[PDB]
Write a new protein. Structure first.
Lengths: 471, 471, 471, 471
C-alpha cells in the first residue's frame, strides 16, 4: 500500500493555545504541473545575487513607463537604473508616481517632482498674486497619476487634490479638491484602477471618474458609488494592483484584518485561518507598516506581504484547492526575507535590500541570498495511521545542478508540535541527474505521524511525489 | 465496523409537545478544516478576561473611525477607548453614530452629540428668528450617519429627519423630513447600507438615495422602490450589517418571526426550525428587546443574537451543510451569556458586560469567563441501531494547554430526552500533546442511542473525529 | 499490459537550472481527430517549394482587398502578386496598410502611399498657404487604415493622427491628432479591431470609436475606457488579430512577458511555463523584434511567433488539454525557420523568407524546405515505471507517399536530458500503404524512461498511437 | 463479441499526400432516430421525376409570396409555375427578388422588373427633367427587397442603392446611395436578414437599419456596429439564409475558405477538415461560382453547396456528433448532381436542372434521377483489430418497395485507400418486408479493416444497425 503524502501545505498544532494551524512551506513555491504520478512539484525560491551598490536601504521602486526604465529610492538618493538622479529626504517607504515630464515622489508630507532635465520642483499652492483658487494643502500621504495629473491625498483629512494640467507643480487652477464623503472619514490609500481614481479609506473604498465638464469651477471627478466596497486598508502600502483589481489588507475598523481581492462592489477573502492568526499576532502598529508587492514569472503570479516578522507569499496560479500561502525568510532562524521592491526589467527581476545598501538581481539557478546558503522546509499533514509500520519513504527530486552533495534532514512528529531525530540523506549531487532520495525504514505510527523534510542548500531544490509504503 | 458520529449538530425530542428538535452545541463553534479523517472540528468560544472597570453595564458601542477608537456607553458615562469623555442619561440600550465633528448618541428620545472639542449639543429645531423651516420633531428612536449628515427616526410616525450640512445640531434648512409612505406605519430602525438610507418598518424595508437636488425645498432623498424588501424587524436593535447587507429578525406583522438576510430586493431565511421555535417561545416583548451584533475572527463570521433567555450564534463560514447555530451561556445552568457588544480594536476583541461594570478582552488561550469555569456540550444525533453493541467511543481531542487534568462527562440517552449515567474521562492534561480520549466499552443499543459529551473547563476544548465501533 | 504514450507534448529537465520543462514537437502539428484508439494524430508541417524570385528578404505582406491581390515588400521593391509596382526604402520590417485609392507603407517614419495609377505620394502636413492646422507630425511608428482613413502613430509621443477624408496625403483639416492620455507613455502599435482604433502602448491598450461630430475642431474619435485592457505589447510587431481580437506579447512594464488574447476588457494568457521561459530567455532587445502572424488551414488556426532563435506556433484548434505549442525549424541543428509572412491567395499559401531573395508556396505533400530534407521531432513524457520491461513499442504511421524509404531514429532517456542509443527503423516506403512501424525489444525501466522518436525526411510524416507493452 | 459499426461517416487515407480524410456517405442522409439497437438510420436521397419542360438549364428560383407561386428562370425565359411570363437574356445565375408590384431579376448588370400587369421596366436614373438627384448607377451585382424598396449593389465599388418608395423603377429621389465603408473594399453580395440590409463584402459583413428620418436628403439607413462580422464571402451566390441567420462560404482574404454560420457579430465554422480540403481543391474561381441553397423536409435541415465537381449537403438536424456532411452525385462515376434550385410548393419539392431543359419534383418513394439508377455508398471507419477473424456482417434494411431485387456490393479495405474483392448480397426484394441482409463469413483482420457497402438501385435504400461478430 503506497500512499502519496502531499507537501504543498502541512498541518500542525499551536502549542500556545492548542489549535490546529497550517504549516506553510518555507522558501518554496508550488508549481502545478503533471510530472510523473504527481500533478505538481515544489521549486525553491530563486536566489539573490548582488548587482548594484546603492546609497542605503531600499525605500521605493517603480517602472517608469515614460523613460522605459526602473526608478529606485534607495537611501538618500534616487536612481534611474544604476545612475543617481536626485536626493530624497526621509527614512522610510516613500510613495512613487510618474508622468509625461517628471517622476514624482511622495515623501515627508510633500510631493517632490524630479524632472528628467534635472530640476526638482515641489507641489505648492498657486502664488497669491494670481486670482486662482487657494486650498489648504496639508501633508501629502499618498500620490498617484491619472490622465496627465497627479492625485494626492491629504494626511488624514478625507480630501484629495489633482494637480494642474499645464503645471504639474501646482494644483488645478479652479477645481482641484475632492472629498470621498461617503463615510465618517479615512483616506489612507490612493491609486488608479482602470480609469477611476480609487481612494481607500478605512471601512470604505471609493471610485472617482471624470465628469467631462469644462466650465470653470465645475468638478472634473464624480464619485461612483455603484462600485463602493465596504472595507478599508490597514496602511498606505497595504494595497496593490494584483490581477485586474486591488488586493489589500483590511483595517480593524471592520473586524479582524484579513487579505482581500476587490471584486465588483465586493471584496473576497484570500487569507486562510492560519494567515489570519498570523496577521492578528501583529498590532495595529506594525500592521500599518506592512508592504505588499507582486511578481510574475514562470506563470507564477505571486503576491507578497511584508510584515516586521513574516514575509508571506500567495501564489494565485496554484490555488485550485484553496489559497496556497508560503513563507520567505533569510538564514536558519526565521529572520525576515531581505528581498523587497521586486521589479522586472529587461529580462531580469531585481530587488532592493531590507538591511544593506545593495540591489540584487534574483538569479534562478541558485538558492543562496548574496552567496549565503538558505534553509527550505516542506511539512506533511498529520494523519491517523494507528499501528501501521512504515517503509520506503521516497521523494522525486530533480538533481544535477549543485556545488555540493547537499543533504536533507528528515524527521517525524507524533503530536504535531514536537519532532524526533533528524536523519541526513542526500538530495542533490553535482552533475548526477538520478539520485533516488529515499529512506528505507521509518518506524511504526502509534497514533499520528508527520514529516519535516528540511533542506539547507546553495542550489535549487526541486521536489515532488513524496510517497510512503504503509503496508 | 467503524462509524463516524457528527458532533456539530445533534437531534433530540422536545417533551413539551413530543416534537423533534435540534440540539445545538453549547459554547462550541464548528471550525471546518480537514484535520485527519474529519473535515472539521469544534473549538470552545474564547474566554473573557478582565480589561477595564466602568460605571455600569454596557449600553452601546461603536468604532469611531474619525477618532480611530472604540466608543462605549457603560452605565451613565461615555468612554472613548478607556478615558471618560462624557455622561449619558437613562439606563436602556442607546443608539450610536459618529461623524467628522462629533460622536452622536441616541438616548431618551434625543440625539446628543458630544463634539471632539468638549461641547455637548442636542438636536433641536432652528430658532424662530431664522428664515428657516420648523419641523415637528418627535422622539428619536434610531440614528445613523451618511455623507456628513445625521439621519434620525421620529418615534412611531414613519418620519425621518436629516440634519443640516454646516450646522449638525439642527435639521436641514428646507428639506429635512421624509416618509416611507408605502406602508401604514413603521420606522422601527434606520441604517445605512452602501449609500442608501435603509428604513426598517414592520413588514417593509425602504431604500433612499441622494437626489442631488440643489434648489431650495427640493427633496434630498428619493426612495428606490426597485430594492424594497417586504419584511420588517421586531425591535429597534433586531438588525446588523452581516455580509454585504443587513441581517434582521422579522416582525410578527409578517408571520412567525425568524432570522433573515437581505438579498437583492428579497429576504432569505437563515434560521432553522429549532431556532424558529426558540424565537417563537418569546412574546412581542422580550423579542423587541433582542440585540443582534456581529463578530469576525479566524474566518469565523459569527452573527450573535441576545434575547432575555438565550444567546444564539450563527456561523456563516461553516454553513456548508445548512445553517450552523450554537448556544452561548454562562455558568453550568443555562444562564444567559454575560459578554455583549463585541468590537475589534488594535489586535484584540473587547466586549462589554450585562451584569457587572466590567469590560473584558476575549482571550483565546483560555475559556474561562472572568476566572470562572464554563460548561461545554456536544450532542450527537440519534440513530437507529437495533442490537448493535457499541464499543470504542473515541474522540480526537487537542490537548496540552490546561491548568488541571480536566475531565469530560460522557453519557448516553435512549429516548432523546433523559440521559443515563455520566462517566468521567480525562479529555485533557497539562503539557501533554498525545492523549487518546477513549471509552472502551459502551453498552448495547436496544432501539436508539445518542451521546452527550459534556466538558467543564478553565481551558480550551478542541474536539474532532468522534467515532464508534458498531460491530 | 499495453499502455499508450502521448506524443503531443513531452517532458524533460533543463540542465542549466534543473527544472522540469516541456518538450515541444519540432515541425509537427497535432490534429485532434478520432483515428484508431487514439483520438488525434501528428502531421508534419507543410513543405516550402519555390514560387518567385524577389528583390531580397521579405519585409512585409498584406492582402489588398481593393485589388484582390497580395502585396509583398521584399527587399527594397514592392510587389503586387509577382510584378513590381514601386520602390521602398529602408531594410527592416515595414508597416503595411491599404485602402480604396492606394497601398500605404510605413517606413523610416514616413507614410509612403503607392497609388494604383502609378503615383507615389508621402503623407505630410498641409501647405501653409491654407488656414488648416499645422500639426507636429513626427516619426511614424505603425500605421493602419479604417473607414477611409490612414491612421498612424507618432513614434515615442503617445499621439496618433488620421488623414483627411478627401485627401489621403495630408492629415485631417481640423481634428487629426489624438492622444491616449491614460498612460505616462507608450504608443508601440496601432490597429483596428472591429470599428474601434486600438492603440497598444506599454502597460495599456485603448480603444477609440467615432463620435460622428460634424463641426470643425471637434474630435472625430473618443476613447473607450470600458474596453481598455491594462497590458502593453513588447514590440511594434508583437500583435496579430487572432480569433476575434488581437493576440499579443505583453510588455516588461507589467512583469514577465507572455502571450495573451484579448477578451472583453481582459487578456487571457495563452503561453505555458515553458513558453514563458523561452520568451524570458531574450532581452527587451530581440524581444521588441519578435514578429507575430496568423495562419489558417484545415481547421488549423495557427499563431506563429518569430523570435531571433525560436519560431513558436500555437494551435488554438488543438488546445483542449491545455495550450498546444510546437516549434518550427530549418535544418538539423535548431536553426530558425526561414519562412515568414504567410498569406493565402487563391488556393495556395505563399511565404516570404529570412535569408534568400525567394518566395515559396507551401506544398502539402512534402516536408522539405526548398528541396532540403528537414528534421521532425516528437517526444514522450517521462513516466516512473520501476523494474518494468518494455516490449513491442509500436507507432501508427500513414505511409505510402515518399520518394525514399525514410528511416526514424528511436532513442530513450532515463533522466530527461541525455539520450542513449539511436536505433533506425524504416518508417516509410514509397507506394506502400501498410508498414506497421514498431520495435520489438526495448530495455528495462529502472526508474524513468522517455522516448525521442526523431524523423528526417523529404516527404510528409504522419504518426499517432505510440504504445508499449509493459508486462 | 458483437460490435456495432457506425456508417454515417467513414475514415480513410488520401493517396495524394497520405493524410487522413473523412469518407462522406454518397446520396445517403443520416436520420437520427431510435429504431432498434441502432439509434439512427440512413435513407437514400429522394429521386427526381420529370415535371416540366422548360427553355434551358435553370438560372434562378424564388418563391414569390405576393403572388404565392414559384418563379423559375430557366434558359432564356422567366417562368411563373409552369407558365411563361417574360424573357431574360444571359447565361449565368441571376439574382431574384419580388414585391407587391413586380418580380425583379438582377441579370447582365441590370435590375429588370417584370410587373404583374405585363410591363417590363428597368431600374435607371431619374429623367433629367425632374429636379431629383442623379446617381452613378453602374452595373448591378446583387439585389434584394426590403420594405417595398429594391436594394442592389454596384460592382466592386462598396456602394449600393435603394429604389424610390413610390416609383420602384428609379432610385430614391434624395437619398438612395449608401456605402459599407468599414472596409477597403467588398460588396460581393446583398441580402436582408430580419429588418437589416446585410452587405457581405470580402473581409466584412455589414448590417444597415432604417432611421425613419423624414426630412429630404436625410440618410434612411445607418450601419449597425454591434452586429458586424469580420468575415467575407467568396462569391455572390456563396450565401443563403439557413436557419435564422446566414450561412456562407468565406473569402480567401481572411484565410483559407470554410463554411460558416453567422452568430451575433461572429461566425461559427461548420465545415470539417475534410470539407475544407475539398474547398481548397478549387481555385479562387470555381469557388466564386459555387451556389449555396437550403432544403427543409422531414425535419431535415439541409444546406446544399454546388461546386463544379462536388455537391455537399450539411444536415443540421443530425449533427449531435459534429458536422454531418454528405455528398450528392449523378450516375455511377462521380458525375456531379444534376438537381439544382430546390423550392417547396404545395406539397412537393421542385428542382430545376444543371444540364437539361427540364424540371423535376423529388419523388420520395424512388431513388432514380429521371429514371436513371443511382449509386449509394456507405463507408465504415477504419479500426485496428489485429488477428480478429470477423464474422456475421449484418445490416438492418427496410425492404419491400422495389422493382427488382437490387443487390449490394460489399468489400473491405485493409489500408484505407485500396478496396478489395466485392461480393453481391441481395439487399432488397419487391414486396418482401422482412429480409435479413447478412454476410456470414468475413475474413481475418491483419492490422486494419474498413468496409464499403455500395448500392445501385432505382428504389429507396434504408440501412441501419451495421454489426459484426469479432470473436
Amino acid at each position: 500500500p503506497i500512499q502519496q503524502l502531499p507537501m504543498m501545505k502541512g498541518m500542525g498544532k499551536d502549542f500556545k493555545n492548542a489549535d490546529y494551524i497550517d504549516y506553510l512551506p518555507v522558501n518554496m513555491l508550488a508549481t502545478p504541473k503533471e510530472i510523473l504520478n504527481s500533478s505538481g512539484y515544489l521549486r525553491s525560491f530563486p536566489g539573490i545575487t548582488k548587482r548594484y551598490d546603492m546609497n542605503g536601504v531600499s525605500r521605493g521602486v517603480e517602472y517608469n513607463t515614460a523613460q522605459n526604465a526602473v526608478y529606485r529610492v534607495c537611501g538618500g538618493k534616487l536612481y534611474k537604473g544604476e545612475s543617481e538622479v536626485g536626493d530624497v529626504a526621509g527614512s522610510g517607504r516613500v510613495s512613487m508616481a510618474h508622468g509625461r515630464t517628471s517622476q514624482a515622489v511622495g515623501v515627508n508630507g510633500q510631493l517632490v517632482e524630479y524632472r528628467y532635465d534635472g530640476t526638482v520642483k515641489t507641489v505648492s499652492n498657486w502664488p497669491a498674486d494670481s486670482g486662482f483658487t487657494q486650498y489648504e494643502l496639508g501633508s501629502v500621504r499618498d500620490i498617484t497619476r491619472l490622465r496627465g495629473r497627479y492625485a494626492w491625498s491629504k494626511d488624514g483629512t478625507d480630501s484629495w487634490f489633482i494637480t494642474d494640467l499645464e503645471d504639474e507643480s501646482h494644483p488645478d487652477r479652479y477645481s482641484a479638491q475632492y472629498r470621498a464623503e461617503s463615510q465618517p472619514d479615512g483616506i489612507i490609500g490612493i491609486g488608479t484602477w482602470r480609469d477611476f481614481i480609487v481612494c481607500f479609506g478605512s471601512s470604505t473604498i471609493e471610485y472617482f471618474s471624470l465628469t467631462g465638464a469644462t466650465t470653470a469651477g465645475a468638478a472634473l471627478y464624480v464619485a461612483q458609488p455603484s462600485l463602493m466596497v465596504q472595507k478599508g486598508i490597514a496602511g498606505t502600502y497595504c494595497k496593490t494592483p494584483f490581477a485586474d483589481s486591488y488586493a489589500f489588507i483590511s483595517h480593524p475598523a471592520t473586524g479582524a484584518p484579513s487579505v482581500y481581492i476587490i471584486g465588483s462592489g465586493q471584496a473576497s477573502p484570500i487569507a486562510t485561518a492560519s494567515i489570519e492568526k498570523i496577521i492578528r499576532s501583529y498590532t495595529a502598529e506594525e500592521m500599518a507598516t506592512g508592504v505588499m508587492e507582486t511578481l510574475r514569472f514562470d506563470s507564477h503570479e505571486l503576491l507578497i506581504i511584508h510584515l516586521p516578522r513574516h514575509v508571506l507569499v500567495y501564489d494565485a496560479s496554484s490555488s485550485q484547492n484553496g489559497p496556497q500561502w508560503c513563507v520567505l525568510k533569510t538564514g536558519l532562524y526565521d529572520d525576515v526575507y531581505r528581498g523587497v521592491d521586486f521589479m522586472y526589467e529587461g529580462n531580469q527581476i531585481t530587488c532592493g535590500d531590507k538591511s544593506e545598501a545593495v540591489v540584487g538581481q534574483l538569479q534562478f539557478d541558485i538558492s543562496s541570498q548574496y552567496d549565503k546558503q538558505q534553509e527550505h522546509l516542506l511539512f506533511t499533514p498529520l494523519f491517523k495511521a494507528d499501528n501501521a509500520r512504515c517503509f520506503d519513504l521516497e521523494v522525486e527530486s530533480s538533481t544535477g545542478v549543485a556545488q555540493y552533495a547537499d543533504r536533507l534532514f528528515l524527521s517525524a512528529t507524533t503530536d504535531g508540535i514536537n519532532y524526533g531525530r533528524e536523519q541526513m540523506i542526500e538530495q542533490n549531487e553535482p552533475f548526477v541527474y538520478d539520485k533516488r532520495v529515499l529512506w528505507k525504514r521509518v518506524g511504526r505510527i502509534r497514533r499520528l505521524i508527520g514529516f519535516k523534510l528540511r533542506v539547507i542548500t546553495k542550489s535549487p531544490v526541486t521536489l515532488s511525489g513524496c510517497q510512503i509504503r504503509l503496508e
